[PDB]
Amino acid sequence: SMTGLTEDEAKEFHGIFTQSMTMFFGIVIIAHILAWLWRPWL
Amino acid sequence: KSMTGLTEDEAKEFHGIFTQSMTMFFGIVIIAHILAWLWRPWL
Amino acid sequence: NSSMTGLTEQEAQEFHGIFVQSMTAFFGIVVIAHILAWLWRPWL
Amino acid sequence: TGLTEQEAQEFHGIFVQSMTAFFGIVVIAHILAWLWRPWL
Amino acid sequence: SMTGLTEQEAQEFHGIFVQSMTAFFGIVVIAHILAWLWRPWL
Amino acid sequence: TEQEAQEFHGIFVQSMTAFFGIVVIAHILAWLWRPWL
Amino acid sequence: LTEQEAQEFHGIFVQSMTAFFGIVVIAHILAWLWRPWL
Amino acid sequence: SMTGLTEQEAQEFHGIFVQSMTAFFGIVVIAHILAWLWRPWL
Amino acid sequence: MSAAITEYMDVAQLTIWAFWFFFAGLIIYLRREDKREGYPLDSDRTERSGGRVKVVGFPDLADPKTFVLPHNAGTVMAPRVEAPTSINATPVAPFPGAPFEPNGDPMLSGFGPAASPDRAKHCDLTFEGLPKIVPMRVATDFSIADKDPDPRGMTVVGLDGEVAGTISDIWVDRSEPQIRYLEVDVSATKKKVLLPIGFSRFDKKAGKVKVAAIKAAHFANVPALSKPDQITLYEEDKVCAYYAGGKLYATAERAGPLL
Amino acid sequence: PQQLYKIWLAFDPRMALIGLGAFLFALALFIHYMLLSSPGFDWLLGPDHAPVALSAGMSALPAGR
Amino acid sequence: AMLSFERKYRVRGGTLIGGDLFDFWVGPFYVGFFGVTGFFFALLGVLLIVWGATIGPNAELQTYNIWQISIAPPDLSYGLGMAPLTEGGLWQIITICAIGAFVSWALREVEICRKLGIGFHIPFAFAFAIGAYLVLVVVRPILMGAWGHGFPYGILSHLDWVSNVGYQFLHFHYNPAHMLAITFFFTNCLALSMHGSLILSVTNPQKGEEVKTSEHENTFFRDIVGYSIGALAIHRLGLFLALSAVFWSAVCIVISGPFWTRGWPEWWNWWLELPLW
Amino acid sequence: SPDLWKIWLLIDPRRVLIAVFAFLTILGLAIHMILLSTTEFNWLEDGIP
Amino acid sequence: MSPDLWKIWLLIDPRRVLIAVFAFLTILGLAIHMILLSTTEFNWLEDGIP
Amino acid sequence: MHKIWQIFDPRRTLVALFGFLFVLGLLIHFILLSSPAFNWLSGS
Amino acid sequence: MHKIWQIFDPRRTLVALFGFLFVLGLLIHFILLSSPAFNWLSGS
Amino acid sequence: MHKIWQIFDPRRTLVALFGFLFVLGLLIHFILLSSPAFNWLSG
Amino acid sequence: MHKIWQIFDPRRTLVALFGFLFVLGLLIHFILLSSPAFNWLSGS
Amino acid sequence: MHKIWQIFDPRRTLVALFGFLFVLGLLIHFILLSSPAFNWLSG
Ligand code: BCL
Numbered sequence A: 001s002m003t004g005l006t007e008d009e010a011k012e013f014h015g016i017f018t019q020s021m022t023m024f025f026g027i028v029i030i031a032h033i034l035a036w037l038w039r040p041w042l
Numbered sequence B: 001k002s003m004t005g006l007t008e009d010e011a012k013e014f015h016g017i018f019t020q021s022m023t024m025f026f027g028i029v030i031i032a033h034i035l036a037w038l039w040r041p042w043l
Numbered sequence C: 001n002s003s004m005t006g007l008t009e010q011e012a013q014e015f016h017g018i019f020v021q022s023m024t025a026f027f028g029i030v031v032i033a034h035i036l037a038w039l040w041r042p043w044l
Numbered sequence D: 001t002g003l004t005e006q007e008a009q010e011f012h013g014i015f016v017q018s019m020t021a022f023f024g025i026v027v028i029a030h031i032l033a034w035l036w037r038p039w040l
Numbered sequence E, H: 001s002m003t004g005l006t007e008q009e010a011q012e013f014h015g016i017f018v019q020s021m022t023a024f025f026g027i028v029v030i031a032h033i034l035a036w037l038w039r040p041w042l
Numbered sequence F: 001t002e003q004e005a006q007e008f009h010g011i012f013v014q015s016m017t018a019f020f021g022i023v024v025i026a027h028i029l030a031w032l033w034r035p036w037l
Numbered sequence G: 001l002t003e004q005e006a007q008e009f010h011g012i013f014v015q016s017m018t019a020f021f022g023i024v025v026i027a028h029i030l031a032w033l034w035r036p037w038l
Numbered sequence I: 001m002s003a004a005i006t007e008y009m010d011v012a013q014l015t016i017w018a019f020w021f022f023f024a025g026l027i028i029y030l031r032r033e034d035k036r037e038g039y040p041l042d043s044d045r046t047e048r049s050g051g052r053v054k055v056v057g058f059p060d061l062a063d064p065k066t067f068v069l070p071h072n073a074g075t076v077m078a079p080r081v082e083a084p085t086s087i088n089a090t091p092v093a094p095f096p097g098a099p100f101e102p103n104g105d106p107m108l109s110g111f112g113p114a115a116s117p118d119r120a121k122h123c124d125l126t127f128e129g130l131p132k133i134v135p136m137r138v139a140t141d142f143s144i145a146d147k148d149p150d151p152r153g154m155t156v157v158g159l160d161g162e163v164a165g166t167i168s169d170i171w172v173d174r175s176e177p178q179i180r181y182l183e184v185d186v187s188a189t190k191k192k193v194l195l196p197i198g199f200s201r202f203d204k205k206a207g208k209v210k211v212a213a214i215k216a217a218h219f220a221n222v223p224a225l226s227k228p229d230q231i232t233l234y235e236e237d238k239v240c241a242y243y244a245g246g247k248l249y250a251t252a253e254r255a256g257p258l259l
Numbered sequence J: 001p002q003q004l005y006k007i008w009l010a011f012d013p014r015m016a017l018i019g020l021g022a023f024l025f026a027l028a029l030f031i032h033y034m035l036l037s038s039p040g041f042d043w044l045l046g047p048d049h050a051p052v053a054l055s056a057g058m059s060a061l062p063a064g065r
Numbered sequence K: 001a002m003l004s005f006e007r008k009y010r011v012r013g014g015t016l017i018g019g020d021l022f023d024f025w026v027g028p029f030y031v032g033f034f035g036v037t038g039f040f041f042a043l044l045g046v047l048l049i050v051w052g053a054t055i056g057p058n059a060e061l062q063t064y065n066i067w068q069i070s071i072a073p074p075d076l077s078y079g080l081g082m083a084p085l086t087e088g089g090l091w092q093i094i095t096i097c098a099i100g101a102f103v104s105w106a107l108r109e110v111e112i113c114r115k116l117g118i119g120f121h122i123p124f125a126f127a128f129a130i131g132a133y134l135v136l137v138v139v140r141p142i143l144m145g146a147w148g149h150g151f152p153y154g155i156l157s158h159l160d161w162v163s164n165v166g167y168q169f170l171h172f173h174y175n176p177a178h179m180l181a182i183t184f185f186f187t188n189c190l191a192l193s194m195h196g197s198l199i200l201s202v203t204n205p206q207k208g209e210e211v212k213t214s215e216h217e218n219t220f221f222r223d224i225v226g227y228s229i230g231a232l233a234i235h236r237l238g239l240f241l242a243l244s245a246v247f248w249s250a251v252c253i254v255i256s257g258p259f260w261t262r263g264w265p266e267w268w269n270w271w272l273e274l275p276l277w
Numbered sequence L: 001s002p003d004l005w006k007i008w009l010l011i012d013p014r015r016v017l018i019a020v021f022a023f024l025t026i027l028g029l030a031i032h033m034i035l036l037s038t039t040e041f042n043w044l045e046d047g048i049p
Numbered sequence M: 001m002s003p004d005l006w007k008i009w010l011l012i013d014p015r016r017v018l019i020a021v022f023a024f025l026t027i028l029g030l031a032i033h034m035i036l037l038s039t040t041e042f043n044w045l046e047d048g049i050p
Numbered sequence N, O, Q: 001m002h003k004i005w006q007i008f009d010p011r012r013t014l015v016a017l018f019g020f021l022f023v024l025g026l027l028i029h030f031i032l033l034s035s036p037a038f039n040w041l042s043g044s
Numbered sequence P, R: 001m002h003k004i005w006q007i008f009d010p011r012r013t014l015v016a017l018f019g020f021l022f023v024l025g026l027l028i029h030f031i032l033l034s035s036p037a038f039n040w041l042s043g
């Protein structure tokens, strides 16, 4: 609206954003479980 | 008429080139790291 | 309109051909120089 | 600020729910931290 | 066509440029042969 | 004009050659003073 | 420049140059007599 | 021609200059003779 | 709570890194503020691309900022669009980065040092709405300081020391009392022209005004006013630019070089 | 030189005399100062300048690398 | 490249040396003859600094850490003669290149302002900083007697040089020209802060208000301190303070050693030995 | 919040992308450097293997 | 993983992101090489081997 | 209280709040690091 | 892969590439000259 | 390879090339003068 | 080879050439003075 | 050759040459004073 974006475009932008965050927060979990296997910190 | 001026059939072509041009670079990186592991492993 | 830079397809293919030929000559010279340098004294 | 009364309704409605989700995450993290090493 | 030169003028300039550069490289080759005969660096 | 672009070479090249000759004379005398190579 | 007055300046420029060089050469000869450097 | 000095004014001024400089240089050379007599620098 | 975070890091190192981050942000902000006048740039890259690629560099431009002018003079946006113009010159050589030649008669050409934009066609105003720069014939409450020459009746001489007229009136500034212009009554066309103070030297011994910008015969082409009691921002700029052009175009020896 | 009087047709004598006088005075001051600095030609020390001799193993300046 | 209103001002002529040989623009820059000379002086100076870092003080203390790279002047036993390249002649060559580059920059500015038709205040002001550098590396070493009195070229080492030179006089705060220069520097900083604050306050008023006029600028400082200096006079004063600071700093450094070889507090004894007290 | 997507109606979606990319890159660099600063997690001078 | 991701080139222009990524990759490569050259273990020039 | 947004700009408030929360979290993590009893990157 | 020249201007790309390559060559030579192992002016 | 002069203009290119060649020659000579094994001014 | 002296001004070229030669001569003389085996003033 | 004054201003050439010669002489005297074998300001 203010930023020149309609509602129907905002909905699918939100969907794609969520689907990208899912993969980004999925790969980090693998990285952190490998790091814990390597050298635990807690 | 989006905020870049690229038509619907132009962003598709740019993406199609971009994915391959990045995959080959990553493959070269993978080969270089496989060779570097056999030289002086760090973990 | 025209292309984002103003070059047509043929005018951007002639440049690509000359560019890749120059790059290939450069890389061949570099490869020969590195082979000679390794024959001089290795680093790994 | 050039906002109508009804425009200032759903914004608050979303704002409170987002804040309370953040607070729930904070509470879980703090309970786990106390289970790790208490500070009192 | 950004340099304000046509094909013919570019070719005419390039001929003299390449001839001068070749004449400049010959002297360098001779000087390096003499310097190698003076005190080899390899 | 045509009377400078193609003619003024005839004096420029002669002056350059005359300068190089004096340079060579100086270098020969310097070598006879103290060789470096 | 006009041939009537273009080397008339050169005519006295040459003489001034020669006069400047004569005393320079005399000074250098005296300096070599005082303490040779080569 | 540039500085607006008539061919007589310049020729008049040059004589005064070339006589005053003569007197100045005579004074200077006398001073240098005395100074060399005092303590030679060569 | 101590001064050593780890075996190597301490507090005074984290503080300097935080300062560097803040400084990078501040530099980006300042460079974005710098780009409110004259962008996007005019280059060959834009025109070759058929007006498609716009050259702004990094960072890009900011959202428009509004100035409101007093006495209902209007509103001006800090980043705005302006109409591309056709210059009065012709390139010396076709390669990029080459200079231009001031086609025509250089003084009356509007190019080079004798160039100016087109400002608003209204007079600058005071806090009460009066015109700001006016002659002393209407600012009667003004006066010349004591023990000072009072340059009325002084002869004005040109670049070559030839008289080109006499001073007739003095234009002052109501808000800040100082002299902004001199009025010269040219004795070659029976006209009156303005002369900025920045281009005149006061020879108070013999009572003269020296104008080293243009010669005596050039005082006949100075741009004129619309009304004899006030001036606008457009005309002031035109008058100043005409004199500024003489710093390069006055004589044949002023284009250079020394050797 | 024969016709040197033409040199005053290009340079204004009124400025030339000022410049020459100023330059000559500056040169004289510089040369006097240079002599005053030198250890051989320093007349302010007096005609009867006798520096102090060192009778024993003494040195006016400390040693330095 | 060009601003949207710049093409009107790219005119031919106004050069000092060169004429039409080097009269062109390279990107946004104007080069000219002095542009070529200055650029290549700077390039050779940079390359020699990098080579001096490559050689290092030794083969063991050589390092590419930017804080620790230092190129040092010769020994005091060489006097004013020319030192070997590895023992301090590289410093002398780099000093010559730096002087050439600075002078070329100033002359290029003179050419630019001749082209634009404006005054010559900017190169004139730059000449003061150039003169301060020249006093640092040319005048003081000649008066003292050796090139070894110059400072080393390094980011952290020239601070060590400043500290040791300062402590050669046991208390450098008591240097009077030093006090004058410091007063000018602090006053310049204060005046700059006030000029910026006032211009921004007038140009960016309270919300829902129009741009302020010239009377407000004078009224503000007449109501704070009882006097206002004006729009042109504030720039006059800023230039005056900024140049006086540098002039008095050059005076303060050129009298330390050449004209005074004792502690700086002792210099004040003339005041304490007056017969009044 | 099930109607959170309207946050894209007020903030332009072509700036959050750049901001998050730069923020994630800088955060990753900072965490890698903090780990390198320690003597327990430094993988370049740990002495293994 | 979001097949319509190609729409991302309608938001940000490709040319400036290409310039940015090329500069960033060059800087990162130089930094990593210098960091490795700054350590005793991985300095392949001063290791002495072979 | 749903009239508070008639005074404060929602966008400005959200941006400032996110920045403030991020800086506060960073500060608290660093303070915990500086305490030898809570430094988790050392031994135990 | 010849349509890249319809996005980038060849002249600016060429000047930037040549500058980067020249600087890189100088940098590598200086890095090699700073180590006694590979210094060919005194080590060879 | 003769259309390069339709991309680069001779007037600026030749100036830059000559300047860089001169600076490179000076750098190589200075590097040699600083290496005792190749200094030719030691007798 | 001579097709240069048409828009390449000889008058402007001579000044630059003389300056270049003078600077080069000064540099070479000072470099010779920096070496003890060729310094013709201090020696002998 | 003698037409060199057709392509050069005689006045400016003299003004520049005199300063050049003065600076050159000053430099040579400075160099001679800095060599203890040729310094004449002793004894
Ligand atoms: C200390 C123990 C391990 C180690 C433990 C971890 C752990 C735990 C993590 C990493 C992660 C990373 N490590 Mg590691 N890592 C080690 C040593 C290294 C060394 C080295 C010189 O030895 C290098 C070069 C790296 C490099 C990396 C990066 C690949 C990655 C962080 C980049 C980032 O945050 O992007 C963020 C910036 C962006 C802009 C991403 C945005 C994504 C967008 C949507 C996609 C566009 C492309 C984007 C620009 C790049 C995508 C790359 C992917 C995010 C991977 N690590 C040591 C050996 N490392 C992190 C990771 O795996 O991230 C997935 C992570 O969680």
Ligand code: BCL
Binding pocket: K102, K129, K130, K132, K133, K162, K163, K165, K166, K167, K172, K173, K178, K181, K182, K246, K249, K250, K252, K253
């Ligand atoms: C223990 C040491 C002593 C002390 C010993 C000294 C010594 C020794 C010196 C000073 C000097 C100064 N001291 Mg002190 N000083 C002390 C304490 C102080 C204190 C304080 C708060 O206590 C202050 C405020 C000062 C302040 C000052 C200034 C008056 C002065 C430095 C400014 C200057 O000279 O500008 C001069 C500016 C320049 C030289 C800039 C030149 C730059 C030119 C233009 C070259 C271009 C730069 C670059 C190449 C361009 C390209 C760069 C990038 C590629 C773009 N001192 C202590 C007590 N001080 C210095 C001085 O007076 O020098 C004249 C000086 O030598």
Ligand code: BCL
Binding pocket: D022, D025, D026, D029, D030, D033, L031, N017, N018, N021, N022, N025, N026, N032, N040
């Ligand atoms: C010291 C004991 C524990 C520890 C004790 C705690 C405690 C207690 C807390 C954290 C919290 C956090 N810790 Mg921890 N943490 C430790 C060590 C680490 C290390 C490390 C290098 O070892 C890292 C990278 C982190 C990182 C984090 C973040 C995930 C989180 C801070 C969020 C924030 O700042 O919001 C600021 C960001 C915004 C406001 C963004 C703006 C709005 C956004 C869009 C909405 C979401 C906000 C934020 C992103 C929520 C993230 C939650 C996710 C589920 C990760 N911790 C050690 C091991 N940590 C906090 C937390 O859980 O927050 C949720 C918290 O309360």
Ligand code: BCL
Binding pocket: C022, C025, C026, C029, C030, C031, C033, C034, C037, O018, O021, O022, O025, O026, O032, O038, O040, P028
């Ligand atoms: C171990 C150290 C070895 C050594 C081992 C190597 C190895 C291995 C290599 C070099 C290479 C180079 N070395 Mg080495 N080198 C040594 C000592 C030297 C000495 C010396 C004083 O002793 C000199 C002068 C050099 C000089 C050089 C350069 C010729 C070259 C870097 C090219 C460049 O920067 O292009 C940058 C500039 C450009 C790319 C732009 C200019 C090119 C033109 C204008 C563009 C068109 C391209 C054209 C069609 C084809 C290429 C032509 C190029 C001129 C080659 N080396 C010692 C003996 N050297 C590299 C090389 O061979 O390059 C070919 C290389 O791989």
Ligand SMILES: CC[C@H]1c2cc3[nH]c4c(c3C)C(=O)[C@H](C(=O)OC)c4c3nc(cc4[nH]c(cc(n2)[C@@H]1C)c(C(C)=O)c4C)[C@@H](C)[C@@H]3CCC(=O)OC/C=C(\C)CCC[C@H](C)CCC[C@H](C)CCCC(C)C
Binding pocket: K038, K041, K042, K043, K045, K046, K094, K095, K097, K098, K101, K102, K105, K122, K123, K125, K126, K128, K129, K152, K153, K154, K155, K158, K242, K243, K246
């Ligand atoms: C005199 C009043 C103040 C002043 C004025 C001033 N400075 C100026 C100007 C003016 C009016 C310009 O017009 C000019 C300019 O272009 O500004 C943008 C400039 C300038 N002042 C600069 C810097 C500068 N000014 C300083 C000071 C001051 N400048 C004074 C306080 C300082 C200080 C205090 O340190 C610095 C660092 C430049 C940004 C610029 C001049 C740029 C220039 O000359 O460029 C040509 C040279 C090069 C590009 C490369 C030189 C090559 C050398 C080999 C470099 C190294 C030399 C050095 C001796 C060795 C290393 C030293 C170590 C300490 C690291």
Ligand SMILES: [Ca+2]
Binding pocket: B042, B043, L042, L043, L044, L045, L046, L047, L048, L049
């Ligand atoms: Ca390891």
Ligand SMILES: [Ca+2]
Binding pocket: C043, C044, M043, M044, M045, M046, M047, M048, M049, M050
């Ligand atoms: Ca190895």
